Amino acid sequence: DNVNIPDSTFKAYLNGLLGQASTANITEAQMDSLTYITLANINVTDLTGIEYAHNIKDLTINNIHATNYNQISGLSNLERLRIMGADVTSDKIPNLSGLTNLTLLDLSHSAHDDSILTKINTLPKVTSIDLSYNGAITDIMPLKTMPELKSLNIQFDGVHDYRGIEDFPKLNTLLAYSQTIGGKKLINSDIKSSKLTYNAENQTLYVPFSLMTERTVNYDGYVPDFVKSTASSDTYFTMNEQQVNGNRLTITSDGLTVSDVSKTDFDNLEKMEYNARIDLSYQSYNTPEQFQNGGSYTISMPIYDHYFTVD
Protein backbone atom coordinates (compact mmCIF):
# COMPACT_ATOMS: atom_id res chain seq x y z
CA ASP A 1 0.00 0.00 0.00
CA ASN A 2 2.05 3.00 -1.17
CA VAL A 3 0.76 4.93 -4.11
CA ASN A 4 3.18 6.00 -6.80
CA ILE A 5 2.71 9.66 -7.66
CA PRO A 6 5.53 10.54 -10.08
CA ASP A 7 4.58 14.29 -10.51
CA SER A 8 6.17 16.42 -7.76
CA THR A 9 3.58 19.22 -7.85
CA PHE A 10 0.70 16.68 -7.86
CA LYS A 11 1.99 14.83 -4.86
CA ALA A 12 2.74 18.08 -3.08
CA TYR A 13 -0.92 18.96 -3.56
CA LEU A 14 -2.19 15.57 -2.16
CA ASN A 15 0.13 15.69 0.76
CA GLY A 16 -1.55 19.08 1.21
CA LEU A 17 -5.06 17.76 1.60
CA LEU A 18 -3.74 15.10 4.07
CA GLY A 19 -1.85 17.77 6.08
CA GLN A 20 1.63 16.37 5.28
CA ALA A 21 5.01 17.65 4.04
CA SER A 22 5.46 18.24 0.25
CA THR A 23 7.35 15.07 -0.58
CA ALA A 24 5.86 12.82 2.11
CA ASN A 25 4.60 9.34 1.11
CA ILE A 26 0.91 8.47 0.55
CA THR A 27 -0.77 5.07 1.06
CA GLU A 28 -3.62 3.31 -0.64
CA ALA A 29 -6.04 4.28 2.15
CA GLN A 30 -5.04 7.96 2.26
CA MET A 31 -5.93 8.18 -1.51
CA ASP A 32 -9.17 6.41 -0.72
CA SER A 33 -10.17 9.01 1.92
CA LEU A 34 -10.25 11.91 -0.58
CA THR A 35 -13.60 13.28 -1.58
CA TYR A 36 -12.30 15.96 -4.04
CA ILE A 37 -9.28 16.88 -6.06
CA THR A 38 -8.88 20.52 -7.29
CA LEU A 39 -5.81 21.17 -9.38
CA ALA A 40 -6.02 24.88 -10.44
CA ASN A 41 -3.38 26.70 -12.49
CA ILE A 42 -0.66 24.52 -11.00
CA ASN A 43 1.55 22.67 -13.44
CA VAL A 44 0.90 18.97 -13.26
CA THR A 45 2.32 17.24 -16.33
CA ASP A 46 1.26 13.76 -15.40
CA LEU A 47 -1.78 12.53 -13.53
CA THR A 48 -0.34 9.13 -12.57
CA GLY A 49 -1.77 8.03 -9.23
CA ILE A 50 -5.11 9.81 -9.54
CA GLU A 51 -6.55 6.33 -10.39
CA TYR A 52 -6.32 5.46 -6.65
CA ALA A 53 -8.71 8.26 -5.60
CA HIS A 54 -11.75 5.83 -5.81
CA ASN A 55 -14.06 7.81 -3.66
CA ILE A 56 -13.72 11.25 -5.20
CA LYS A 57 -16.98 12.98 -5.98
CA ASP A 58 -15.54 16.11 -7.49
CA LEU A 59 -12.52 16.66 -9.72
CA THR A 60 -11.83 20.21 -10.97
CA ILE A 61 -8.88 20.59 -13.33
CA ASN A 62 -8.03 24.04 -14.71
CA ASN A 63 -4.99 24.86 -16.76
CA ILE A 64 -2.53 22.13 -15.64
CA HIS A 65 -0.99 21.29 -19.08
CA ALA A 66 -1.16 17.55 -18.66
CA THR A 67 -0.08 15.61 -21.76
CA ASN A 68 -3.32 13.69 -21.45
CA TYR A 69 -6.11 13.04 -18.89
CA ASN A 70 -6.21 9.34 -19.48
CA GLN A 71 -6.23 8.28 -15.88
CA ILE A 72 -9.61 9.82 -14.98
CA SER A 73 -11.57 7.31 -17.12
CA GLY A 74 -11.83 4.77 -14.28
CA LEU A 75 -13.20 7.11 -11.64
CA SER A 76 -16.59 5.52 -11.62
CA ASN A 77 -17.77 7.30 -8.48
CA LEU A 78 -17.17 10.75 -9.90
CA GLU A 79 -20.21 13.15 -9.70
CA ARG A 80 -18.90 16.46 -11.08
CA LEU A 81 -16.11 16.83 -13.57
CA ARG A 82 -14.45 20.08 -15.04
CA ILE A 83 -11.49 20.09 -17.43
CA MET A 84 -10.56 23.56 -18.80
CA GLY A 85 -7.39 24.80 -20.46
CA ALA A 86 -6.53 26.57 -23.69
CA ASP A 87 -4.16 23.64 -24.46
CA VAL A 88 -6.84 21.04 -23.88
CA THR A 89 -7.34 19.56 -27.35
CA SER A 90 -9.80 16.69 -27.92
CA ASP A 91 -7.16 13.88 -28.16
CA LYS A 92 -6.14 14.45 -24.56
CA ILE A 93 -9.50 13.36 -23.12
CA PRO A 94 -10.17 9.65 -23.33
CA ASN A 95 -13.60 8.05 -23.48
CA LEU A 96 -15.72 8.81 -20.43
CA SER A 97 -18.40 6.11 -20.94
CA GLY A 98 -17.05 4.53 -17.68
CA LEU A 99 -18.12 7.62 -15.63
CA THR A 100 -21.54 6.14 -14.93
CA ASN A 101 -22.28 8.19 -11.83
CA LEU A 102 -21.29 11.49 -13.51
CA THR A 103 -24.05 14.05 -13.33
CA LEU A 104 -22.19 17.26 -14.43
CA LEU A 105 -19.58 17.62 -17.18
CA ASP A 106 -17.89 20.96 -18.07
CA LEU A 107 -15.22 20.98 -20.73
CA SER A 108 -15.45 24.82 -21.25
CA HIS A 109 -12.66 27.22 -22.25
CA SER A 110 -10.63 24.73 -24.17
CA ALA A 111 -9.39 23.76 -27.59
CA HIS A 112 -12.19 21.26 -28.29
CA ASP A 113 -13.35 20.01 -31.74
CA ASP A 114 -16.27 17.90 -32.92
CA SER A 115 -14.59 14.55 -31.96
CA ILE A 116 -15.16 15.30 -28.29
CA LEU A 117 -18.86 14.36 -28.68
CA THR A 118 -18.40 10.65 -29.32
CA LYS A 119 -16.51 10.34 -26.04
CA ILE A 120 -19.26 12.02 -23.98
CA ASN A 121 -22.56 11.19 -25.65
CA THR A 122 -23.03 7.80 -23.92
CA LEU A 123 -22.92 9.23 -20.41
CA PRO A 124 -25.98 7.80 -18.64
CA LYS A 125 -26.57 10.18 -15.74
CA VAL A 126 -25.15 13.45 -17.11
CA THR A 127 -27.91 16.15 -16.91
CA SER A 128 -25.69 19.23 -17.81
CA ILE A 129 -22.70 19.77 -20.08
CA ASP A 130 -20.70 23.03 -20.62
CA LEU A 131 -18.71 23.23 -23.87
CA SER A 132 -18.87 26.94 -24.09
CA TYR A 133 -15.79 28.85 -25.33
CA ASN A 134 -14.69 25.93 -27.56
CA GLY A 135 -14.56 27.79 -30.80
CA ALA A 136 -14.21 24.82 -33.15
CA ILE A 137 -17.35 22.94 -32.11
CA THR A 138 -19.85 23.35 -34.93
CA ASP A 139 -22.45 20.60 -34.48
CA ILE A 140 -24.16 19.30 -31.36
CA MET A 141 -26.56 16.73 -32.84
CA PRO A 142 -24.49 13.66 -31.68
CA LEU A 143 -25.61 14.51 -28.13
CA LYS A 144 -29.15 13.67 -29.09
CA THR A 145 -28.33 10.05 -27.96
CA MET A 146 -27.78 11.14 -24.30
CA PRO A 147 -30.75 9.90 -22.28
CA GLU A 148 -30.63 12.34 -19.40
CA LEU A 149 -29.24 15.64 -20.82
CA LYS A 150 -31.34 18.61 -19.65
CA SER A 151 -28.87 21.48 -20.17
CA LEU A 152 -26.23 22.27 -22.71
CA ASN A 153 -24.08 25.34 -22.82
CA ILE A 154 -22.27 26.02 -26.16
CA GLN A 155 -21.96 29.82 -25.76
CA PHE A 156 -19.28 31.31 -28.00
CA ASP A 157 -18.88 28.12 -30.10
CA GLY A 158 -19.33 27.65 -33.93
CA VAL A 159 -22.74 25.84 -34.17
CA HIS A 160 -24.81 26.61 -37.24
CA ASP A 161 -27.72 24.17 -37.54
CA TYR A 162 -30.47 23.50 -34.97
CA ARG A 163 -32.53 21.04 -37.09
CA GLY A 164 -32.91 17.86 -34.96
CA ILE A 165 -32.82 19.61 -31.59
CA GLU A 166 -36.14 17.97 -30.82
CA ASP A 167 -34.57 14.50 -30.89
CA PHE A 168 -32.88 15.35 -27.60
CA PRO A 169 -35.06 13.54 -25.15
CA LYS A 170 -34.79 15.84 -22.17
CA LEU A 171 -32.91 19.00 -23.17
CA ASN A 172 -34.88 21.92 -21.70
CA THR A 173 -32.14 24.60 -21.77
CA LEU A 174 -29.91 25.59 -24.62
CA LEU A 175 -27.45 28.46 -24.10
CA ALA A 176 -25.93 29.29 -27.52
CA TYR A 177 -25.57 33.08 -27.48
CA SER A 178 -22.99 34.42 -29.89
CA GLN A 179 -21.78 31.52 -32.03
CA THR A 180 -19.04 32.30 -34.56
CA ILE A 181 -19.60 30.03 -37.51
CA GLY A 182 -16.15 29.41 -39.11
CA GLY A 183 -14.17 31.13 -36.31
CA LYS A 184 -11.89 28.22 -35.44
CA LYS A 185 -12.81 25.51 -37.94
CA LEU A 186 -12.52 27.67 -41.05
CA ILE A 187 -14.96 27.61 -43.95
CA ASN A 188 -13.73 27.87 -47.51
CA SER A 189 -15.40 27.36 -50.85
CA ASP A 190 -13.74 26.80 -54.27
CA ILE A 191 -16.04 28.56 -56.77
CA LYS A 192 -16.05 29.28 -60.51
CA SER A 193 -16.47 32.95 -61.45
CA SER A 194 -19.82 31.87 -63.03
CA LYS A 195 -21.42 31.53 -59.58
CA LEU A 196 -21.01 35.33 -59.35
CA THR A 197 -22.65 38.13 -61.41
CA TYR A 198 -20.69 40.96 -63.07
CA ASN A 199 -22.45 43.86 -64.88
CA ALA A 200 -20.28 45.76 -67.40
CA GLU A 201 -22.26 48.96 -67.54
CA ASN A 202 -22.91 49.57 -63.84
CA GLN A 203 -19.56 48.14 -62.79
CA THR A 204 -21.22 46.15 -60.06
CA LEU A 205 -20.28 42.80 -58.50
CA TYR A 206 -23.05 40.67 -57.03
CA VAL A 207 -22.52 37.82 -54.62
CA PRO A 208 -25.60 35.68 -53.88
CA PHE A 209 -26.06 34.38 -50.32
CA SER A 210 -26.84 30.94 -51.67
CA LEU A 211 -23.04 30.67 -51.47
CA MET A 212 -23.02 31.01 -47.66
CA THR A 213 -23.95 27.30 -47.19
CA GLU A 214 -23.22 27.50 -43.44
CA ARG A 215 -25.69 30.22 -42.43
CA THR A 216 -27.69 29.79 -39.21
CA VAL A 217 -30.78 27.60 -39.54
CA ASN A 218 -33.27 27.32 -36.63
CA TYR A 219 -34.87 23.96 -35.85
CA ASP A 220 -37.84 24.99 -37.95
CA GLY A 221 -35.99 25.96 -41.12
CA TYR A 222 -36.10 29.70 -40.41
CA VAL A 223 -33.07 31.32 -42.13
CA PRO A 224 -32.42 34.76 -40.60
CA ASP A 225 -31.00 37.41 -42.80
CA PHE A 226 -27.56 38.81 -42.55
CA VAL A 227 -27.48 42.37 -41.19
CA LYS A 228 -27.84 45.17 -43.73
CA SER A 229 -25.39 47.56 -42.02
CA THR A 230 -22.21 48.38 -44.01
CA ALA A 231 -20.21 49.53 -40.89
CA SER A 232 -17.05 47.51 -40.19
CA SER A 233 -18.44 46.31 -36.88
CA ASP A 234 -21.26 44.69 -38.78
CA THR A 235 -19.82 43.69 -42.11
CA TYR A 236 -16.28 42.92 -43.22
CA PHE A 237 -16.04 42.23 -46.97
CA THR A 238 -12.76 41.31 -48.53
CA MET A 239 -11.61 41.17 -52.14
CA ASN A 240 -8.14 39.79 -52.88
CA GLU A 241 -7.31 40.03 -49.15
CA GLN A 242 -8.43 43.64 -49.14
CA GLN A 243 -11.40 44.90 -47.16
CA VAL A 244 -13.83 46.70 -49.49
CA ASN A 245 -15.10 50.06 -48.33
CA GLY A 246 -18.42 49.96 -46.52
CA ASN A 247 -19.76 52.55 -48.96
CA ARG A 248 -19.06 50.26 -51.93
CA LEU A 249 -21.65 47.81 -50.62
CA THR A 250 -25.38 47.20 -50.77
CA ILE A 251 -26.99 44.31 -48.85
CA THR A 252 -30.46 42.82 -49.65
CA SER A 253 -31.63 39.45 -48.29
CA ASP A 254 -30.53 37.71 -51.45
CA GLY A 255 -27.08 39.12 -51.80
CA LEU A 256 -24.37 41.70 -51.60
CA THR A 257 -23.60 44.21 -54.29
CA VAL A 258 -20.25 46.02 -54.79
CA SER A 259 -20.04 49.23 -56.86
CA ASP A 260 -17.01 50.52 -58.78
CA VAL A 261 -15.83 47.22 -60.11
CA SER A 262 -14.12 47.18 -63.54
CA LYS A 263 -13.94 43.98 -65.70
CA THR A 264 -10.23 44.35 -64.81
CA ASP A 265 -10.99 44.05 -61.11
CA PHE A 266 -13.35 41.14 -62.01
CA ASP A 267 -10.77 39.08 -63.95
CA ASN A 268 -8.26 39.91 -61.21
CA LEU A 269 -10.26 38.16 -58.51
CA GLU A 270 -8.93 35.13 -56.62
CA LYS A 271 -9.95 35.62 -53.05
CA MET A 272 -13.07 36.68 -51.10
CA GLU A 273 -14.12 36.85 -47.47
CA TYR A 274 -17.63 37.40 -46.09
CA ASN A 275 -17.55 38.05 -42.33
CA ALA A 276 -20.76 39.57 -40.93
CA ARG A 277 -23.34 39.48 -38.17
CA ILE A 278 -26.56 37.56 -38.71
CA ASP A 279 -29.66 39.45 -37.64
CA LEU A 280 -31.03 36.93 -35.17
CA SER A 281 -32.64 38.75 -32.25
CA TYR A 282 -33.90 36.85 -29.26
CA GLN A 283 -37.60 37.65 -30.08
CA SER A 284 -37.26 37.11 -33.89
CA TYR A 285 -37.43 33.25 -33.91
CA ASN A 286 -39.59 30.44 -32.61
CA THR A 287 -38.49 28.20 -29.79
CA PRO A 288 -39.33 24.45 -29.72
CA GLU A 289 -41.87 23.13 -27.14
CA GLN A 290 -39.50 21.29 -24.86
CA PHE A 291 -37.82 24.58 -23.85
CA GLN A 292 -41.19 26.33 -23.19
CA ASN A 293 -41.96 25.49 -19.64
CA GLY A 294 -39.22 27.17 -17.56
CA GLY A 295 -36.55 26.26 -20.12
CA SER A 296 -34.40 28.59 -22.25
CA TYR A 297 -33.51 28.56 -25.94
CA THR A 298 -31.10 31.30 -26.81
CA ILE A 299 -29.46 31.01 -30.30
CA SER A 300 -29.17 34.78 -30.49
CA MET A 301 -26.91 36.92 -32.59
CA PRO A 302 -24.44 34.68 -34.37
CA ILE A 303 -21.57 35.76 -36.59
CA TYR A 304 -20.67 34.26 -39.93
CA ASP A 305 -17.20 33.84 -41.47
CA HIS A 306 -16.67 32.37 -44.93
CA TYR A 307 -13.60 32.38 -47.18
CA PHE A 308 -13.65 31.83 -50.97
CA THR A 309 -11.37 31.08 -53.90
CA VAL A 310 -12.49 32.23 -57.34
CA ASP A 311 -11.98 30.40 -60.67
Side-chain angles (χ1 to χ4, degrees):
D1 77 17
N2 225 56
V3 205
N4 161 60
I5 308 165
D7 185 298
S8 71
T9 322
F10 198 21
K11 181 171 201 160
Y13 171 81
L14 290 167
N15 272 323
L17 300 174
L18 301 168
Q20 278 185 189
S22 309
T23 64
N25 278 322
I26 297 142
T27 67
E28 275 189 14
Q30 286 172 309
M31 294 305 268
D32 260 7
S33 65
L34 304 169
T35 61
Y36 78 102
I37 290 175
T38 302
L39 324 160
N41 232 339
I42 68 182
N43 194 73
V44 175
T45 294
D46 170 42
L47 282 177
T48 299
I50 213 178
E51 340 95 78
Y52 293 74
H54 299 101
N55 304 281
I56 66 169
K57 305 307 173 197
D58 299 331
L59 177 48
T60 307
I61 287 165
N62 165 44
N63 199 40
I64 63 147
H65 313 303
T67 346
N68 62 54
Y69 299 98
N70 281 3
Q71 303 91 359
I72 85 216
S73 62
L75 300 167
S76 59
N77 291 324
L78 218 35
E79 290 165 358
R80 279 135 281 147
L81 175 71
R82 307 187 157 68
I83 315 179
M84 286 171 280
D87 59 327
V88 194
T89 35
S90 298
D91 62 325
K92 285 186 166 185
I93 312 282
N95 211 274
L96 316 184
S97 59
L99 280 41
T100 43
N101 301 293
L102 197 79
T103 72
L104 180 126
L105 177 67
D106 164 348
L107 306 166
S108 53
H109 289 106
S110 322
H112 286 313
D113 67 74
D114 291 332
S115 66
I116 192 63
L117 277 62
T118 47
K119 293 182 164 150
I120 74 174
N121 74 355
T122 43
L123 286 163
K125 298 186 177 152
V126 179
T127 80
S128 57
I129 289 175
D130 193 342
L131 287 163
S132 79
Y133 293 92
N134 284 279
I137 286 205
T138 67
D139 178 17
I140 64 151
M141 294 308 156
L143 306 178
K144 74 179 43 175
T145 73
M146 302 191 70
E148 292 303 317
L149 194 67
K150 300 180 184 167
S151 189
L152 179 79
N153 187 348
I154 50 161
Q155 284 195 333
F156 304 91
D157 294 355
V159 163
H160 62 263
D161 202 336
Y162 301 92
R163 286 172 300 162
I165 201 87
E166 286 166 300
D167 300 337
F168 279 72
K170 287 197 184 176
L171 185 62
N172 70 21
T173 284
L174 189 66
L175 306 153
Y177 180 56
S178 185
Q179 300 290 296
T180 308
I181 301 151
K184 312 277 176 215
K185 199 217 196 165
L186 291 3
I187 308 167
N188 184 77
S189 292
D190 280 307
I191 59 140
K192 296 287 170 74
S193 19
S194 71
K195 289 280 240 327
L196 304 193
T197 297
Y198 184 95
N199 169 296
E201 313 97 72
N202 304 355
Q203 296 216 330
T204 65
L205 178 53
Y206 177 60
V207 190
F209 291 142
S210 43
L211 280 176
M212 317 315 168
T213 66
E214 316 297 289
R215 58 178 310 155
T216 304
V217 188
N218 199 15
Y219 80 102
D220 57 7
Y222 168 49
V223 172
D225 284 341
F226 297 108
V227 299
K228 313 287 177 48
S229 169
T230 60
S232 290
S233 75
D234 291 325
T235 303
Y236 179 88
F237 195 46
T238 257
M239 298 192 290
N240 286 330
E241 275 157 35
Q242 295 278 11
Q243 192 202 358
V244 189
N245 199 346
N247 340 4
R248 300 192 45 201
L249 303 150
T250 277
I251 305 131
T252 70
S253 296
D254 307 325
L256 160 141
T257 299
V258 211
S259 56
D260 317 333
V261 192
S262 55
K263 185 93 192 146
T264 287
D265 304 349
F266 181 58
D267 301 316
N268 302 341
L269 195 70
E270 282 166 27
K271 300 175 161 300
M272 286 199 303
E273 190 200 357
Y274 187 59
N275 181 27
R277 301 183 191 287
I278 293 157
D279 186 355
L280 188 71
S281 216
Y282 179 77
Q283 292 173 20
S284 76
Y285 56 84
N286 307 322
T287 89
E289 177 170 20
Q290 53 195 92
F291 309 87
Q292 271 178 14
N293 219 7
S296 320
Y297 189 82
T298 67
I299 59 173
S300 307
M301 298 302 191
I303 286 163
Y304 193 77
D305 203 354
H306 204 134
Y307 299 87
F308 294 87
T309 42
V310 183
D311 206 11

Short mmCIF file of all heavy atoms in Angstrom, two decimals, residues 171-196:
data_model
loop_
_atom_site.label_atom_id
_atom_site.label_comp_id
_atom_site.label_asym_id
_atom_site.label_seq_id
_atom_site.Cartn_x
_atom_site.Cartn_y
_atom_site.Cartn_z
N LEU A 171 -33.51 17.68 -23.13
CA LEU A 171 -32.91 19.00 -23.17
C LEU A 171 -33.97 20.14 -23.05
O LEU A 171 -34.79 20.36 -23.95
CB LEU A 171 -32.07 19.13 -24.44
CG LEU A 171 -31.22 20.38 -24.68
CD1 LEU A 171 -30.18 20.52 -23.60
CD2 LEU A 171 -30.50 20.28 -26.03
N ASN A 172 -33.93 20.85 -21.93
CA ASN A 172 -34.88 21.92 -21.70
C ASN A 172 -34.25 23.31 -21.59
O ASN A 172 -34.92 24.27 -21.20
CB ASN A 172 -35.74 21.57 -20.50
CG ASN A 172 -34.98 21.64 -19.21
OD1 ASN A 172 -33.95 22.29 -19.11
ND2 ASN A 172 -35.52 20.99 -18.21
N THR A 173 -32.98 23.41 -21.98
CA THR A 173 -32.14 24.60 -21.77
C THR A 173 -30.96 24.54 -22.71
O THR A 173 -30.14 23.61 -22.68
CB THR A 173 -31.66 24.70 -20.32
OG1 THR A 173 -32.74 25.16 -19.49
CG2 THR A 173 -30.54 25.70 -20.20
N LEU A 174 -30.92 25.52 -23.60
CA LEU A 174 -29.91 25.59 -24.62
C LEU A 174 -29.37 27.00 -24.57
O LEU A 174 -30.11 27.94 -24.86
CB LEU A 174 -30.52 25.36 -25.99
CG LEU A 174 -29.36 25.23 -26.99
CD1 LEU A 174 -28.56 23.94 -26.69
CD2 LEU A 174 -29.80 25.33 -28.46
N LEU A 175 -28.10 27.14 -24.24
CA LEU A 175 -27.45 28.46 -24.10
C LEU A 175 -26.42 28.53 -25.20
O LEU A 175 -25.39 27.89 -25.06
CB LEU A 175 -26.72 28.51 -22.75
CG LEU A 175 -27.60 28.16 -21.54
CD1 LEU A 175 -26.81 27.60 -20.37
CD2 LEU A 175 -28.49 29.38 -21.15
N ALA A 176 -26.70 29.29 -26.27
CA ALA A 176 -25.93 29.29 -27.52
C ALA A 176 -25.78 30.72 -28.05
O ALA A 176 -25.53 30.96 -29.24
CB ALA A 176 -26.60 28.40 -28.58
N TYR A 177 -25.92 31.70 -27.15
CA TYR A 177 -25.57 33.08 -27.48
C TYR A 177 -24.23 33.15 -28.19
O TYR A 177 -23.27 32.49 -27.80
CB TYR A 177 -25.48 33.88 -26.22
CG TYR A 177 -25.12 35.33 -26.43
CD1 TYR A 177 -25.89 36.15 -27.27
CD2 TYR A 177 -24.02 35.91 -25.77
CE1 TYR A 177 -25.58 37.48 -27.46
CE2 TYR A 177 -23.70 37.25 -25.97
CZ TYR A 177 -24.49 38.02 -26.81
OH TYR A 177 -24.23 39.36 -27.02
N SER A 178 -24.21 33.93 -29.27
CA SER A 178 -22.99 34.42 -29.89
C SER A 178 -22.04 33.32 -30.40
O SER A 178 -20.86 33.27 -30.00
CB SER A 178 -22.27 35.36 -28.92
OG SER A 178 -21.16 35.94 -29.54
N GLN A 179 -22.55 32.47 -31.27
CA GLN A 179 -21.78 31.52 -32.03
C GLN A 179 -21.01 32.20 -33.16
O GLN A 179 -21.57 33.06 -33.85
CB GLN A 179 -22.73 30.50 -32.70
CG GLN A 179 -23.56 29.73 -31.73
CD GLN A 179 -22.71 28.78 -30.96
OE1 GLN A 179 -22.12 27.86 -31.51
NE2 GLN A 179 -22.60 29.02 -29.67
N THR A 180 -19.77 31.78 -33.40
CA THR A 180 -19.04 32.30 -34.56
C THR A 180 -18.73 31.17 -35.53
O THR A 180 -17.74 30.42 -35.41
CB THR A 180 -17.75 33.08 -34.22
OG1 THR A 180 -18.03 34.09 -33.25
CG2 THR A 180 -17.16 33.75 -35.46
N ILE A 181 -19.64 31.05 -36.48
CA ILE A 181 -19.60 30.03 -37.51
C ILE A 181 -18.33 30.29 -38.37
O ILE A 181 -18.21 31.33 -39.06
CB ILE A 181 -20.87 30.09 -38.38
CG1 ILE A 181 -22.15 29.89 -37.54
CG2 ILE A 181 -20.79 29.10 -39.52
CD1 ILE A 181 -23.40 30.57 -38.09
N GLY A 182 -17.38 29.34 -38.31
CA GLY A 182 -16.15 29.41 -39.11
C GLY A 182 -15.02 30.19 -38.42
O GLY A 182 -14.03 30.53 -39.05
N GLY A 183 -15.17 30.43 -37.12
CA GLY A 183 -14.17 31.13 -36.31
C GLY A 183 -12.93 30.33 -35.96
O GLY A 183 -11.84 30.85 -36.00
N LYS A 184 -13.08 29.07 -35.59
CA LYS A 184 -11.89 28.22 -35.44
C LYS A 184 -11.78 27.13 -36.54
O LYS A 184 -10.75 27.00 -37.19
CB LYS A 184 -11.77 27.64 -34.02
CG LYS A 184 -11.96 28.66 -32.90
CD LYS A 184 -10.70 29.45 -32.56
CE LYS A 184 -11.01 30.50 -31.50
NZ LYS A 184 -10.23 31.76 -31.71
N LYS A 185 -12.85 26.39 -36.79
CA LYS A 185 -12.81 25.51 -37.94
C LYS A 185 -13.24 26.39 -39.13
O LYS A 185 -14.39 26.82 -39.21
CB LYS A 185 -13.68 24.27 -37.72
CG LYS A 185 -13.38 23.08 -38.61
CD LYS A 185 -14.70 22.42 -38.94
CE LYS A 185 -14.56 21.02 -39.48
NZ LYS A 185 -15.88 20.33 -39.43
N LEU A 186 -12.29 26.69 -40.01
CA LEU A 186 -12.52 27.67 -41.05
C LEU A 186 -13.34 27.11 -42.20
O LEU A 186 -13.24 25.92 -42.54
CB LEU A 186 -11.19 28.22 -41.58
CG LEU A 186 -10.25 29.13 -40.79
CD1 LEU A 186 -10.73 29.39 -39.37
CD2 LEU A 186 -8.84 28.52 -40.80
N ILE A 187 -14.16 27.98 -42.79
CA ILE A 187 -14.96 27.61 -43.95
C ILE A 187 -14.49 28.27 -45.24
O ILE A 187 -14.35 29.49 -45.34
CB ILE A 187 -16.43 27.90 -43.69
CG1 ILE A 187 -16.82 27.24 -42.38
CG2 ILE A 187 -17.29 27.40 -44.85
CD1 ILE A 187 -18.16 27.70 -41.84
N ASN A 188 -14.22 27.42 -46.23
CA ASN A 188 -13.73 27.87 -47.51
C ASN A 188 -14.44 27.17 -48.65
O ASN A 188 -14.62 25.95 -48.62
CB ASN A 188 -12.23 27.64 -47.63
CG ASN A 188 -11.68 28.20 -48.92
OD1 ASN A 188 -11.50 29.41 -49.04
ND2 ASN A 188 -11.43 27.34 -49.90
N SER A 189 -14.85 27.94 -49.64
CA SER A 189 -15.40 27.36 -50.85
C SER A 189 -14.55 27.69 -52.08
O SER A 189 -14.12 28.84 -52.26
CB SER A 189 -16.84 27.84 -51.07
OG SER A 189 -17.69 27.31 -50.08
N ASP A 190 -14.31 26.66 -52.91
CA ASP A 190 -13.74 26.80 -54.27
C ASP A 190 -14.84 26.99 -55.31
O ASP A 190 -15.59 26.04 -55.61
CB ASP A 190 -12.91 25.58 -54.65
CG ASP A 190 -11.53 25.58 -54.03
OD1 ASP A 190 -10.83 26.59 -54.22
OD2 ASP A 190 -11.14 24.58 -53.38
N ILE A 191 -14.94 28.21 -55.86
CA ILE A 191 -16.04 28.56 -56.77
C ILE A 191 -15.56 29.08 -58.12
O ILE A 191 -14.54 29.78 -58.20
CB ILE A 191 -17.00 29.60 -56.15
CG1 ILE A 191 -16.24 30.88 -55.79
CG2 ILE A 191 -17.70 29.01 -54.92
CD1 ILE A 191 -17.00 32.14 -56.09
N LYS A 192 -16.29 28.73 -59.18
CA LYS A 192 -16.05 29.28 -60.51
C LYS A 192 -16.62 30.69 -60.52
O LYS A 192 -17.60 30.99 -59.83
CB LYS A 192 -16.71 28.43 -61.61
CG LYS A 192 -16.18 27.01 -61.77
CD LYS A 192 -14.79 26.98 -62.41
CE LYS A 192 -14.19 25.58 -62.35
NZ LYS A 192 -14.83 24.65 -63.33
N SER A 193 -15.99 31.57 -61.29
CA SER A 193 -16.47 32.95 -61.45
C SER A 193 -17.90 33.04 -62.02
O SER A 193 -18.47 34.12 -62.04
CB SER A 193 -15.48 33.75 -62.30
OG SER A 193 -14.62 32.89 -63.05
N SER A 194 -18.47 31.92 -62.47
CA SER A 194 -19.82 31.87 -63.03
C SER A 194 -20.91 31.87 -61.95
O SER A 194 -22.06 32.19 -62.22
CB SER A 194 -19.99 30.63 -63.92
OG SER A 194 -20.02 29.45 -63.15
N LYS A 195 -20.53 31.49 -60.73
CA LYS A 195 -21.42 31.53 -59.58
C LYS A 195 -21.72 32.97 -59.19
O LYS A 195 -22.70 33.22 -58.50
CB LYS A 195 -20.78 30.82 -58.39
CG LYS A 195 -20.70 29.31 -58.51
CD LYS A 195 -22.04 28.65 -58.18
CE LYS A 195 -21.92 27.70 -56.99
NZ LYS A 195 -20.60 27.00 -56.87
N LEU A 196 -20.86 33.89 -59.62
CA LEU A 196 -21.01 35.33 -59.35
C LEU A 196 -21.70 36.07 -60.51
O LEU A 196 -21.93 35.48 -61.57
CB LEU A 196 -19.64 35.96 -59.07
CG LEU A 196 -18.74 35.42 -57.96
CD1 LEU A 196 -17.62 36.42 -57.69
CD2 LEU A 196 -19.51 35.17 -56.68
#
